[PDB]
Amino acid sequence: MGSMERASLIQKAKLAEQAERYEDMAAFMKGAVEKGEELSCEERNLLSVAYKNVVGGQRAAWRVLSSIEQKSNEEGSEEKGPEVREYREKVETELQGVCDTVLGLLDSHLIKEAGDAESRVFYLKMKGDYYRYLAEVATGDDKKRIIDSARSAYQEAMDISKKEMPPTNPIRLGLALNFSVFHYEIANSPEEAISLAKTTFDEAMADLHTLSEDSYKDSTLIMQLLRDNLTLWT
Amino acid sequence: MGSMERASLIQKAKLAEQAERYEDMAAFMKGAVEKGEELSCEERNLLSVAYKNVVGGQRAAWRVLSSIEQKSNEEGSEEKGPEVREYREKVETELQGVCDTVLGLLDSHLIKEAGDAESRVFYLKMKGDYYRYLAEVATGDDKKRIIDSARSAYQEAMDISKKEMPPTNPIRLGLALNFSVFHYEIANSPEEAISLAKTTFDEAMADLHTLSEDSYKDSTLIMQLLRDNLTLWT
Amino acid sequence: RRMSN
Amino acid sequence: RRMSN
Ligand SMILES: [Ca+2]
Ligand SMILES: [Ca+2]
Known part of the structure; x- marks a missing residue:
């Protein structure tokens, strides 16, 4: 993408979103990032x-194959060869490549050139999300360091957002939702997850009165995700 | 794929279907075909x-982008650069590559080694389908020859199926549905399309009484597609 | 949209 | 399935 204009890359990324061609959209946005300029909101x-759509497809595929593999590893299952394991490993490697690409973009050099609270919290939330995606498939030795990388990114984002953003900001709400999911699914801390979700919901509820109608809609839509997770976990 | 076993390629294609990873499934099946052996049903x-899922995604993307392009080419539209046209052309080229791959598989050497009526009608139906997909995006000079390639494949499949298959065979029904769609959308012959659909529906209806319950279900499901197209076009 | 197979 | 963003 080094020969296409930045504006053209953004325009084509929008076209790809409209056409639901998310791999193309990801490649376009990667080229745009690689142009070296800071990104707008x-x-x-x-x-x-x-x-998110690219890794989402890959993660759903991984879960399907992992469940097939673990049913093939049960008592009474017929030996089928190494095919399921090989294909699960291939999908896993591809997912890991996509996460490595995103984290490399964040490290060179999105995060270090983000001074504003909104952009920095956004990038650190992404970093935590993609280390969490890596943690979903990790099995040995580096597992704990990957988990701590996710925890660290999420924590720094939480600190900055508590200091510099209102409790109704959609980025703060989504960050808290994802950090609670990390606590529940990854860090084996369901009480921390529930606590975080209820505290975030309540403090945003208390400040809903400051918002205009459209900001109100934006914030309540994510508070509903928090309430969904709470209803599932309680 | 030349180093993986044929059985392994089939097994992994099934796994990919379960994981909705249709590009992987297509590559696996291509390797299986490339093994040189005839395929089962x-x-x-x-x-x-x-x-079909690969090209379906690419065709939907192409239609979206083509409609955006033709709205950008109307009176009162602001000039946006060559980006929409370039991206539409890229998606189009990728689609054309997938169709060329399928037709090359059919030509080397699936069709010439298919003696049975069912397999031969299946392959010729595929050939007509993928030439029709090429015709949907063609604009000059080779357009008429592409259209005639589709027509020829469809016609030979129709002749063999009329001679060698019962009117309730799902492959014959799907072939007739697709050939009618060709007549309506590609060959500018809506009366031929309607005639073909109603004749196919009626002759299958007349033979429903010979079928078992499950064959009955299989045939009626595609007759319902014929009735849907008829209701749309009448 | 019309049906195909 | 639990919600994420
Ligand atoms: Ca800066
Ligand atoms: Ca043969």
């Missing part, structure tokens, strides 16, 4: 949407 | 499903 959201 | 269906 809209461009950050495009990058996140693109890589 | 189930393997033919796997190949068709894989490449």
Whole structure:
């Protein structure tokens, strides 16, 4: 993408979103990042949407194959060869490559050039998310360091967002939702997850009165995700 | 795929279907075809499903982008650069590559080694389908020859199926449905399309009484597609 | 949209 | 399935 203009890459990423071609969208946004300039709010959201749909497809595939593999590893299952394991490993390697790509973009050099609280919290939330995606498939030795990388990114984002953003900010709400999911699914801390979700919901509820109608809609939509997770876990 | 076993390629194609990873499924089935052996009914269906989902995604993307392009080419539209046209052309080229791959598989050497009526009609139906997909995006000079390639494949399949298969065979029904769609959308012959659909529906209806319950279900499901197209076009 | 197979 | 963003 080094020969295409930055504006053209953004425009084509938008076209790809409209056509539901998220691999193309991700490659376009990667080229845009590689142009070296800081991203706007809209461009950050495009990058996140693109890589989120790519990894989402790969993670769903991984879960399907992992469940097939673990049923093939039960008592009474007929030996089928190494095919399921090999294909699960291939999908896993591809997922890991996508996460490594995102984290390399964040490290060179999105995070270190983000001074504003909104952009920095956004990038650290992404970092925590993609280390969490790596942690979902990790099995040995580096597992604990991957988990702590996710925890560290999430924690720094939480600190900055508590200091510099209102409790109704959608980025803060989504960050708290994802950090609670990390606590529940990854860190084996369901009480921390529930506590975080209820505290975030309540403090945003208390400040809903300051918001305009559209900001109100934006914040309540994510508070509903928090309430969904709470209803599932309680 | 030249180093993986044929049985392994089939098994992994099934796993990919379960994981909705249709590009992987297509590559696996291509390797299986490339092994040089004739395909069973189930393997033919796997190949068709894989490449059908791949091209289906690419065709939907193409339609979205083509509609955006033709709205950008109207009176009162602001000039946006060559980005929409370039991206539409890229998606188009990728689609054309997938169709060329399928047709090359059919030509080397699936069709010439298919003696049975069922397998031969299946392969010729595929050939007509993928030339029709090429015709949907063609614009100059080779357009009429592509259209005639589709027509020829469809016609030979129709002749063989009328001679060698009962009117309730699902492959014959699907072939007639697709040939009618060709007449309506590609060959600018809506009366031929309607005639073909109603004739196919009626002759299958007349023979429903010979079928078992499950064959009855299989045939009626595609007759319902014929009735849907008829209701849309009348 | 019309049906195909 | 639990919600994430
Ligand atoms: Ca800066
Ligand atoms: Ca033969």
